[PDB]
Amino acid sequence: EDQRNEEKAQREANKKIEKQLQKDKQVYRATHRLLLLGAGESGKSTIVKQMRILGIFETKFQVDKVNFHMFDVGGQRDERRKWIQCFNDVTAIIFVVASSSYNMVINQTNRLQEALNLFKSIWNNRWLRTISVILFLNKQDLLAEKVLAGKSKIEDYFPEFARYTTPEDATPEPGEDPRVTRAKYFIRDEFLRISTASGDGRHYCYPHFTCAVDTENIRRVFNDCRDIIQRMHLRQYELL
Amino acid sequence: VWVVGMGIVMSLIVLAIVFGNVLVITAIAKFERLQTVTNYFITSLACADLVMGLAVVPFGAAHILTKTWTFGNFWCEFWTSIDVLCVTASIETLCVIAVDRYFAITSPFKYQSLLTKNKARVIILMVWIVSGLTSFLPIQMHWYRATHQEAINCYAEETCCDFFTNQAYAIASSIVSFYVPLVIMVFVYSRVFQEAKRQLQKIDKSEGRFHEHKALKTLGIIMGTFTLCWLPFFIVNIVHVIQDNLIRKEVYILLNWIGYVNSGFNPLIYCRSPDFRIAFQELLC
Amino acid sequence: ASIAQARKLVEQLKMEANIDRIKVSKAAADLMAYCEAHAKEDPLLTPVPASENPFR
Amino acid sequence: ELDQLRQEAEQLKNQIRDARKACADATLSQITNNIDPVGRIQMRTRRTLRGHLAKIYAMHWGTDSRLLVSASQDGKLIIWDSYTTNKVHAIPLRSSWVMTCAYAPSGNYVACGGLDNICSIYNLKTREGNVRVSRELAGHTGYLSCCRFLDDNQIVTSSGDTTCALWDIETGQQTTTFTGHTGDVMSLSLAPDTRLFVSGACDASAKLWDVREGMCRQTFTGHESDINAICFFPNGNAFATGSDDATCRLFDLRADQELMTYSHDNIICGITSVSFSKSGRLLLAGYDDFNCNVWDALKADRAGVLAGHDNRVSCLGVTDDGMAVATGSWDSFLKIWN
Ligand SMILES: Nc1nc2c(ncn2[C@@H]2O[C@H](COP(=O)(O)OP(=O)(O)OP(=O)(O)O)[C@@H](O)[C@H]2O)c(=O)[nH]1
Numbered sequence: 023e024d025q026r027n028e029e030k031a032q033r034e035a036n037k038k039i040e041k042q043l044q045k046d047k048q049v050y051r052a053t054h055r056l057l058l059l060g061a062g063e064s065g066k067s068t069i070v071k072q073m074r075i076l077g078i079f080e081t082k083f084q085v086d087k088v089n090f091h092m093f094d095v096g097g098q099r100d101e102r103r104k105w106i107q108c109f110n111d112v113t114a115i116i117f118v119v120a121s122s123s124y125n126m127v128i129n130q131t132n133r134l135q136e137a138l139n140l141f142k143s144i145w146n147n148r149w150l151r152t153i154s155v156i157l158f159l160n161k162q163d164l165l166a167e168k169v170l171a172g173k174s175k176i177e178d179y180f181p182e183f184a185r186y187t188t189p190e191d192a193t194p195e196p197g198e199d200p201r202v203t204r205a206k207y208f209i210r211d212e213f214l215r216i217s218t219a220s221g222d223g224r225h226y227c228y229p230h231f232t233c234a235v236d237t238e239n240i241r242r243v244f245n246d247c248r249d250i251i252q253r254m255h256l257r258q259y260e261l262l
Numbered sequence: 263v264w265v266v267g268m269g270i271v272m273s274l275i276v277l278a279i280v281f282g283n284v285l286v287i288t289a290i291a292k293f294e295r296l297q298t299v300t301n302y303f304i305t306s307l308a309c310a311d312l313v314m315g316l317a318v319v320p321f322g323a324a325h326i327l328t329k330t331w332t333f334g335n336f337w338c339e340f341w342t343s344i345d346v347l348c349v350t351a352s353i354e355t356l357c358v359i360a361v362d363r364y365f366a367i368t369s370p371f372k373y374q375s376l377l378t379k380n381k382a383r384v385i386i387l388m389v390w391i392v393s394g395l396t397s398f399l400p401i402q403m404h405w406y407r408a409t410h411q412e413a414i415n416c417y418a419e420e421t422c423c424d425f426f427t428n429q430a431y432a433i434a435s436s437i438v439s440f441y442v443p444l445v446i447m448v449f450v451y452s453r454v455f456q457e458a459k460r461q462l463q464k465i466d467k468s469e470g471r472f473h474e475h476k477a478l479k480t481l482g483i484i485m486g487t488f489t490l491c492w493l494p495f496f497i498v499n500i501v502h503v504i505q506d507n508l509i510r511k512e513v514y515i516l517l518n519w520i521g522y523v524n525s526g527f528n529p530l531i532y533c534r535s536p537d538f539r540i541a542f543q544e545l546l547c
Numbered sequence: 548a549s550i551a552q553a554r555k556l557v558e559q560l561k562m563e564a565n566i567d568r569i570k571v572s573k574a575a576a577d578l579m580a581y582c583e584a585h586a587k588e589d590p591l592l593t594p595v596p597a598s599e600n601p602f603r
Numbered sequence: 604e605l606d607q608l609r610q611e612a613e614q615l616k617n618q619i620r621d622a623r624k625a626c627a628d629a630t631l632s633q634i635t636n637n638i639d640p641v642g643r644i645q646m647r648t649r650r651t652l653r654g655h656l657a658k659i660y661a662m663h664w665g666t667d668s669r670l671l672v673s674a675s676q677d678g679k680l681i682i683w684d685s686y687t688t689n690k691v692h693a694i695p696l697r698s699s700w701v702m703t704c705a706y707a708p709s710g711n712y713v714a715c716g717g718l719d720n721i722c723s724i725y726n727l728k729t730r731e732g733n734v735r736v737s738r739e740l741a742g743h744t745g746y747l748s749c750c751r752f753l754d755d756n757q758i759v760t761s762s763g764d765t766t767c768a769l770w771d772i773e774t775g776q777q778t779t780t781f782t783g784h785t786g787d788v789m790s791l792s793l794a795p796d797t798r799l800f801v802s803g804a805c806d807a808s809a810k811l812w813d814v815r816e817g818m819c820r821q822t823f824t825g826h827e828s829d830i831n832a833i834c835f836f837p838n839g840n841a842f843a844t845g846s847d848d849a850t851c852r853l854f855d856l857r858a859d860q861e862l863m864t865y866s867h868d869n870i871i872c873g874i875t876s877v878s879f880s881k882s883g884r885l886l887l888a889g890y891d892d893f894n895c896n897v898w899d900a901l902k903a904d905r906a907g908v909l910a911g912h913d914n915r916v917s918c919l920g921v922t923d924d925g926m927a928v929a930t931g932s933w934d935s936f937l938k939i940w941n
């Protein structure tokens with residue numbers, strides 16, 4: 023008698039939990055997850071502050087009735103990375119790096135070199151084999167100010183820039199002094215080489231030239247994610 | 263010799279049709295990793311193909327070898343109904359798969375919400391109901407019977423089971439089963455090819471300096487196999503009714519039997535993913 | 548920094564160096580004796596009848 | 604100066620090595636060679652638990668051998684019922700990243716932690732019939748890795764900032780702080796009498812601590828890579844560890860050195876979980892090879908393989924009375940093996 027009543031009580035509760043899980047399944051499947059990562063003094067705080075308007079940090083923003091959920095890690099500041107295993111199912115990884123910090127030395131090698139080493143370590147990780155990277159080249163005006171009418175030259179720090187030519191396909195912004203563009207494309211190619219060294223056709227890179235005051239980052243994040251999902255779906259069916 | 267020779271082929275064909283479909287069905291059912299929304303269409307197609315290979319092929323083979331129908335008229339009608347049902351249901355499933363691929367590729371952000379395990383069952387049930395409504399209903403009733411003397415004589419006799427139809431049914435069934443699910447597939451695959459070309463062009467523009475052989479080699483196979491298998495029959499079906507004394511019975515039977523061969527190639531086309539391969543080794547050994 | 552931090556390690560190793568150690572034979576015998584003594588109360592090692600298995 | 608101090612420590616480390624070497628009278632394999640082998644062991648799954656939307660990282664058997672808890676990436680702890688395979692509770696989380704969970708000895712509290720450097724404690728039985736956050740412990744500067752209920756009022760946890768601390772639930776403030784590791788701490792286990800506990804760090808070292816005193820006692824330097832799992836012998840005088848180099852080693856507190864190692868030439872994958880049996884004869888360990896292995900503690904001979912998971916196994920636990928063993932994997936399915 024008590025047995026029938028309780029088992030009847032227990033059975034109902036499994037049901038009210040299964041209904042709740044079924045309701046939450048659609049919400050879980052709709053959203054997209056991103057991981058925000060970058061070196062120090064790059065400008066991550068300004069970007070996330072601009073994005074919100076309109077030990078961990080979460081931001082929830084909706085574009086075109088699509089839910090994005092971005093994670094930024096600031097509590098864990100260690101050279102060794104073991105918590106990165108939990109981020110093997112994210113849609114994309116956002117990388118923010120200061121483009122103009124070629125001159126600054128942390129004594130240490132130029133920061134660009136540490137950033138490039140970090141990118142190399144991220145790219146070849148075993149658990150991040152099939153995760154794309156969205157690259158933000160921040161501080162677009164400090165670099166121009168340093169390049170134009172500047173005593174400092176990047177050949178002393180980066181020697182290969184002297185033996186370089188600006189790409190024919192490149193399309194410049196209005197009235198750009200010719201050199202600054204060469205410097206930007208040199209910096210971008212130093213990342214594209216690492217990206218394409220061991221791409222294997224499973225994941226790519228999306229370099230971008232973004233300033234801090236720019237308000238179009240929210241569109242770039244949406245478009246790159248859409249392209250990533252489309253490419254993954256095409257590759258699943260053996261069409262690319 | 264001959265009669266023996268044809269018999270040898272009609273057993274190998276039956277075995278090939280049965281084995282692949284049953285293997286696909288058991289591989290999908292046994293493993294929980296392959297339980298996907300897309301895979302329900304594939305198992306529906308495999309079930310239809312298995313029913314075809316187990317119902318219509320052997321008895322038709324016995325008929326053609328013996329050259330005499332040794333069963334009642336009711337069983338002849340049942341055999342014709344099963345044939346029409348299976349043929350109709352073996353194509354709209356391919357159309358549904360093509361539409362699913364179209365939605366998955368062209369609408370990536372809304373793919374999850376559009377298709378759910380609840381809606382896939384409804385779509386499959388609707389396809390099966392439509393396929394069975396045009397097969398059993400107008401065949402069990404005599405709406406499809408012809409009027410010329412040869413058809414009447416064969417209907418009266420209990421030893422001949424041949425296919426005689428009027429223009430209306432021969433046109434309506436062909437339009438419902440073949441012609442409609444062809445333009446949809448053509449348009450869908452053209453759109454998919456355009457999207458793939460656009461993505462490849464974008465990649466080449468992005469990083470061409472540092473760095474249509476797969477798209478064609480896939481789409482051409484997928485479309486051409488079905489088109490070559492099922493095209494001539496669904497032309498002669500209208501031709502031999504529009505003008506009599508033009509198509510011989512032997513050509514009709516040959517084209518109809520060539521159409522049946524398509525039922526053995528579906529696993530070789532839609533089940534070539536690495537997941538299906540890994541699973542196949544475990545079930546087989 | 549290292550000026551005393553290095554010193555701390557030196558003190559700890561000392562504290563960890565003044566301890567009594569028994570021969571591995573005695574510890575091995577004790578472990579084997581315990582395993583033999585409690586070998587009749589492990590359902591995983593000895594398959595019990597299905598009547599008393601709640602998971603069947 | 605500073606170099607001179609460094610020289611002094613190196614001379615000592617030797618003395619320790621010489622003293623440890625002078626103690627090894629005979630190997631554990633030599634003394635245990637006439638025991639009849641257990642032979643082949645066959646285990647088949649009895650239950651399959653579904654309902655987790657993402658991969659599973661942790662689980663903890665109840666003290667009544669009936670209930671258990673688990674955590675996943677969708678931010679939810681689910682309390683199961685192994686006998687009748689029906690759910691009991693479903694606790695949503697504020698953060699979606701969790702790496703550990705615990706179950707109270709009295710069954711009244713459940714704790715969990717993760718990427719956020721905060722440990723949260725829930726009250727299962729309370730007024731109004733809803734699970735409700737009871738306390739939130741903060742102060743660590745690194746992510747948590749494990750936490751075990753020392754009692755119904757005080758909890759000990761280890762974090763990723765090379766420290767372990769003993770908390771007080773009522774006041775929410777640290778009481779004792781343990782330090783001495785160099786790499787991140789990944790696992791710990793408490794003694795049956797709840798007096799000492801061990802921890803395995805990322806610098807290939809394991810230490811023995813004293814809860815009351817608050818100072819380290821001994822150190823073992825057997826492994827050669829990171830240590831992910833650790834378990835403690837039922838007798839109370841031994842423990843076993845698992846490392847990324849696919850080797851399990853059995854140390855000993857009284858002799859203070861390792862006794863036997865378990866390694867095979869056909870495996871090059873990592874190890875995520877290690878557990879013992881009720882009698883201590885069988886050592887069960889999970890790997891990254893999508894399956895589990897069953898060893899023999901006193902002979903280092905495999906006695907069976909537990910397969911059935913489509914992805915790597917991240918959790919493992921043997922119930923108090925030794926009725927069955929449960930495994931959790933990234934396939935979001937929990938299984939009970941008997
Ligand atoms: N003019 C200019 N200033 C920039 C740019 N990016 C960053 N800054 C400045 O960099 C200074 C310090 O860096 P922040 O932008 O605060 O960001 P951060 O120091 O990287 O902070 P976190 O992201 O939290 O690590 C601020 O005064 C910003 O205005 C840029 O593109 N242009």
Ligand SMILES: CN[C@@H]1CCc2c(ccc(O)c2O)[C@H]1O
Nearest residue numbers: 345346349350425435436439518
């Ligand atoms: C017995 N052979 C039948 C005859 C007519 C017919 C077939 C297939 C599909 C159709 O829509 C048909 O109208 C053939 O398989």
